[PDB]
Design a protein around this ligand. Structure first.
Ligand SMILES: *[B]([O])([O])[C][N]S(=O)(=O)C1=[C][C]=C(C2=NN=N[N]2)[C]=[C]1
Length: 351
């Protein structure tokens, strides 16, 4: 590994792991297209299993990027349109607040105040229908962004209806398999359990809990190798041989809404590069300006996504015009600003 990369990564991540008491971490830097891997610490403290290039971590909300790309692929297949009313794919959603709420609003958190989480009380699918029928929007469609699992989770479930595939089968066959992400899972198979890191919350070993729309909003688990491949694919989607997937990748990085310095993609969020990290809270409602029509994927962008579960903390960022990116996977949910600080320190040095 070129010494510059070695040094910038170790000099940044080592103190980070010490300050944040992270049990285990894996990092990939993609530099001029090629990935370089680094690991530290423990996937399972009790059993003294080290983090390796094959360890699975919960991506948490970095999963929203897969959901956005799979939606993008479905659009490219002509199966759905972002301008389609939500009710077109869920006819039972008859309550009048849904008039004017499109797949775009769902995908981009702009439906009018759908909550961060589907309530824990929602167990059955009829419970889920009740939830969305009874939800009262605080705002008109397309006026305010509130980051929400119940918003993009629903987008993901609806985007796959026409295919006739379950969300998992569609994700596996249309995204994971074409990109050779053979160790990326919505449901960890028994064969891979030995690789599945424990997350650590208040020092307790924990895994993600089942919940409504989990798969679609925060349910993917992946290795640092596969996540490096996910970054390469998003960096360079013209490399991709499957036409609708290449298109879906590009659609997920289009700029649909602006709030401050940030643009909302499908799953991905983007800022113009260069940026300062200073530029890069349980509820944060923000007015959005519509980008009419959406701007095509911009190459000079910091494109990123943070992800958390109770026990894990993940971050991915890349800059297309520099062929440069980073994936940070940890089995502790440590503060976002620290992730972004470390990632900026690393990419800025190599750029
Ligand atoms: B995303 O990572 O930004 C979603 N964040 S979330 O706050 O909605 C969230 C946090 C933790 C879980 C979780 N379920 N079981 N363990 N952790 C789910 C959603």
């Amino acid at each position: 590994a070129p010494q510059q990369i070695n040094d910038i990564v170790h000099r940044t991540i080592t103190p980070l792991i010490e300050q944040q008491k992270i049990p285990g971490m894996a990092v990939a830097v993609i530099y001029q297209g090629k990935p370089y891997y680094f690991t530290w610490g423990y996937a399972d403290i009790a059993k003294k299993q080290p983090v390796t290039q094959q360890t699975l971590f919960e991506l948490g909300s970095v999963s929203k990027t897969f959901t956005g790309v799979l939606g993008g692929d479905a659009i490219a297949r002509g199966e759905i349109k972002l301008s389609d009313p939500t009710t077109k794919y869920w006819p039972e959603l008859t309550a009048k607040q849904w008039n004017g709420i499109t797949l775009l609003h769902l995908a981009t958190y702009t439906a009018g105040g759908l909550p961060l989480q589907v309530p824990d009380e929602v167990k059955s699918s009829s419970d889920l229908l009740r939830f969305y029928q009874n939800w009262q929007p605080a705002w008109a469609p397309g006026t305010q962004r509130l980051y929400a699992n119940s918003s993009i989770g629903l987008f993901g479930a609806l985007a796959v209806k026409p295919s006739g595939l379950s969300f998992e089968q569609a994700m596996q066959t249309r995204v994971f398999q074409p990109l050779k992400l053979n160790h990326t899972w919505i449901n960890v198979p028994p064969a891979e359990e030995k690789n599945y890191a424990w997350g650590y919350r208040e020092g307790k070993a924990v895994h993600v809990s089942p919940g409504a729309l989990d798969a679609e909003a925060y349910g993917v688990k992946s290795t640092i190798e596969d996540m490096a491949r996910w970054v390469q694919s998003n960096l360079k989607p013209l490399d991709i041989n499957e036409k609708t997937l290449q298109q879906g990748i590009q659609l997920a990085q289009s700029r649909y809404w602006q709030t401050g310095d940030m643009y909302q993609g499908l799953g991905w969020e983007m800022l113009d590069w260069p940026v300062n990290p200073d530029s890069i809270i349980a509820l944060a409602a923000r007015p959005v300006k519509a980008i009419t029509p959406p701007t095509p994927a911009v190459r000079a962008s910091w494109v990123h996504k943070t992800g958390a579960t109770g026990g894990f903390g993940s971050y991915v960022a890349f800059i297309p015009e520099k062929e440069l990116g980073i994936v940070m996977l940890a089995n502790k949910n440590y503060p976002n600003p620290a992730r972004v600080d470390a990632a900026w320190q690393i990419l800025n040095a190599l750029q």
